[PDB]
Protein backbone atom coordinates (compact mmCIF):
# COMPACT_ATOMS: atom_id res chain seq x y z
CA UNK A 1 0.00 0.00 0.00
CA UNK A 2 2.97 2.43 0.11
CA UNK A 3 5.41 0.56 -2.20
CA UNK A 4 4.23 -1.18 -5.39
CA UNK A 5 0.54 -0.81 -4.52
CA UNK A 6 -1.53 -2.35 -7.34
CA UNK A 7 -4.42 -0.64 -9.12
CA UNK A 8 -7.17 0.03 -8.36
CA UNK A 9 -5.62 1.90 -5.41
CA UNK A 10 -7.89 2.87 -2.49
CA UNK A 11 -6.33 4.88 0.36
CA UNK A 12 -8.00 6.66 3.27
CA UNK A 13 -6.65 10.11 4.14
CA UNK A 14 -6.71 10.07 7.96
CA UNK A 15 -8.72 13.09 9.10
CA UNK A 16 -9.28 15.25 6.01
CA UNK A 17 -6.94 16.48 3.26
CA UNK A 18 -5.93 19.50 5.36
CA UNK A 19 -4.00 22.48 3.97
CA UNK A 20 -0.23 21.87 3.89
CA UNK A 21 -0.66 18.09 3.38
CA UNK A 22 1.41 16.83 0.42
CA UNK A 23 0.76 13.55 -1.41
CA UNK A 24 3.45 11.69 -3.40
CA UNK A 25 2.65 9.44 -6.37
CA UNK A 26 5.51 7.82 -8.29
CA UNK A 27 4.53 5.68 -11.25
CA UNK A 28 5.11 4.45 -14.77
CA UNK A 29 2.92 4.98 -17.81
CA UNK A 30 2.70 1.65 -19.70
CA UNK A 31 3.57 1.83 -23.44
CA UNK A 32 0.22 0.17 -24.36
CA UNK A 33 -1.95 2.16 -21.91
CA UNK A 34 -4.72 4.61 -22.83
CA UNK A 35 -5.88 6.33 -19.64
CA UNK A 36 -5.50 6.51 -15.85
CA UNK A 37 -7.19 8.65 -13.17
CA UNK A 38 -6.15 10.08 -9.79
CA UNK A 39 -9.26 10.99 -7.77
CA UNK A 40 -9.33 12.98 -4.52
CA UNK A 41 -12.67 11.89 -3.18
CA UNK A 42 -15.36 12.50 -0.52
CA UNK A 43 -15.79 8.94 0.77
CA UNK A 44 -15.38 5.75 -1.26
CA UNK A 45 -18.45 6.53 -3.44
CA UNK A 46 -19.14 10.30 -3.15
CA UNK A 47 -17.94 13.45 -4.92
CA UNK A 48 -14.57 13.84 -6.68
CA UNK A 49 -12.97 17.16 -5.62
CA UNK A 50 -10.06 16.73 -8.05
CA UNK A 51 -10.00 14.27 -10.97
CA UNK A 52 -6.57 14.09 -12.66
CA UNK A 53 -6.89 12.09 -15.89
CA UNK A 54 -3.88 11.84 -18.22
CA UNK A 55 -4.96 10.40 -21.59
CA UNK A 56 -2.19 8.88 -23.74
CA UNK A 57 -4.28 8.93 -26.96
CA UNK A 58 -4.51 12.74 -27.28
CA UNK A 59 -1.65 13.45 -24.79
CA UNK A 60 -3.87 15.51 -22.52
CA UNK A 61 -4.00 16.09 -18.75
CA UNK A 62 -7.68 16.65 -17.95
CA UNK A 63 -8.66 18.10 -14.57
CA UNK A 64 -12.26 18.28 -13.38
CA UNK A 65 -14.62 17.78 -10.43
CA UNK A 66 -17.61 15.43 -10.14
CA UNK A 67 -20.00 17.26 -7.78
CA UNK A 68 -23.63 16.33 -7.01
CA UNK A 69 -23.65 13.86 -9.94
CA UNK A 70 -22.24 16.23 -12.63
CA UNK A 71 -18.84 16.81 -14.25
CA UNK A 72 -17.77 20.48 -14.31
CA UNK A 73 -15.79 22.42 -16.90
CA UNK A 74 -12.52 20.65 -17.76
CA UNK A 75 -9.14 22.33 -17.18
CA UNK A 76 -6.47 21.15 -19.66
CA UNK A 77 -3.76 23.87 -19.86
CA UNK A 78 -0.19 22.64 -19.28
CA UNK A 79 3.36 23.66 -20.22
CA UNK A 80 4.59 20.03 -20.21
CA UNK A 81 3.18 16.49 -20.27
CA UNK A 82 5.11 14.04 -18.04
CA UNK A 83 2.71 11.13 -18.81
CA UNK A 84 4.09 10.01 -22.21
CA UNK A 85 4.23 6.29 -23.20
CA UNK A 86 6.85 4.41 -21.17
CA UNK A 87 7.69 7.45 -19.00
CA UNK A 88 8.39 7.30 -15.27
CA UNK A 89 6.96 10.28 -13.34
CA UNK A 90 7.07 11.80 -9.83
CA UNK A 91 3.83 13.58 -8.76
CA UNK A 92 3.65 15.98 -5.80
CA UNK A 93 0.08 17.06 -4.92
CA UNK A 94 -0.34 19.69 -2.19
CA UNK A 95 -3.83 20.57 -0.98
CA UNK A 96 -3.55 24.33 -0.58
CA UNK A 97 -6.03 26.64 1.08
CA UNK A 98 -7.79 27.80 -2.12
CA UNK A 99 -6.28 25.40 -4.71
CA UNK A 100 -4.41 22.13 -5.31
CA UNK A 101 -0.70 22.60 -6.16
CA UNK A 102 0.59 19.84 -8.46
CA UNK A 103 4.21 19.30 -9.52
CA UNK A 104 5.56 16.67 -11.93
CA UNK A 105 9.25 15.68 -11.76
CA UNK A 106 9.99 18.88 -9.76
CA UNK A 107 8.34 21.26 -12.28
CA UNK A 108 4.96 22.97 -11.82
CA UNK A 109 2.24 21.11 -13.77
CA UNK A 110 -1.00 22.84 -12.70
CA UNK A 111 -3.00 24.54 -9.97
CA UNK A 112 -6.66 23.59 -9.53
CA UNK A 113 -8.89 25.99 -7.56
CA UNK A 114 -11.23 24.31 -5.05
CA UNK A 115 -14.80 23.88 -6.30
CA UNK A 116 -15.84 21.73 -3.33
CA UNK A 117 -16.37 23.46 0.03
CA UNK A 118 -13.87 21.16 1.53
CA UNK A 119 -10.54 22.13 2.72
CA UNK A 120 -11.08 18.69 4.45
CA UNK A 121 -14.17 17.04 3.13
CA UNK A 122 -11.67 15.16 0.94
CA UNK A 123 -10.73 11.88 2.66
CA UNK A 124 -10.03 9.27 -0.08
CA UNK A 125 -7.36 8.79 -2.77
CA UNK A 126 -8.49 6.56 -5.63
CA UNK A 127 -6.05 5.74 -8.45
CA UNK A 128 -7.35 3.60 -11.33
CA UNK A 129 -6.73 2.67 -14.97
CA UNK A 130 -3.57 2.14 -17.01
CA UNK A 131 -0.78 3.02 -14.61
CA UNK A 132 1.86 1.11 -12.61
CA UNK A 133 2.59 2.70 -9.23
CA UNK A 134 6.00 2.32 -7.53
CA UNK A 135 5.30 4.55 -4.51
CA UNK A 136 2.24 6.28 -3.00
CA UNK A 137 2.68 8.39 0.18
CA UNK A 138 -0.49 9.42 2.01
Ligand X SMILES: CC(=O)N[C@H]1[C@H](O[C@H]2[C@@H](O)[C@@H](CO)O[C@@H](O[C@H]3[C@H](O)[C@@H](O)[C@H](O)O[C@@H]3CO)[C@@H]2O)O[C@H](CO)[C@@H](O)[C@@H]1O[C@@H]1O[C@H](CO)[C@H](O)[C@H](O)[C@H]1O
Q: Is 71 annotated as a binding residue?
A: yes
* 4: alpha, beta or left? (left if phi > 0; alpha if psi -120 to 50): left
Site string for ligand X, 30-49 (x = CB under 6 A): -------x-x----------
| Nearest one of 53, 72, 58 to 126, comparing CA atoms | 53
Residue count, binding to ligand X (CB under 6 A): 8
Select 64 or 92, whichever has its Cβ closest to ligand X.
64
93 in contact with ligand X (CB under 6 A): no
Select 65 or 92, whichever has its Cβ closest to ligand X.
65
Beta bridge partners of 80: none
Q: Find the DSSP H helices in 40-117.
A: none
71 in contact with ligand X (CB under 6 A): yes
Select 53 or 124, whichever has its Cβ closest to ligand X.
53
Q: Is 75 annotated as a binding residue?
A: yes
Min CB(45)–ligand X separation in Å? 9
CA gap 120, 138 in Å, rounded: 14
CA gap 67, 95 in Å, rounded: 18
Amino acid sequence: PTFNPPVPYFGRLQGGLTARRTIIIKGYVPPTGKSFAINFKVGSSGDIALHINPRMGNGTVVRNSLLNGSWGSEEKKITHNPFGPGQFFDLSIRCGLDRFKVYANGQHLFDFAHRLSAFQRVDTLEIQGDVTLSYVQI
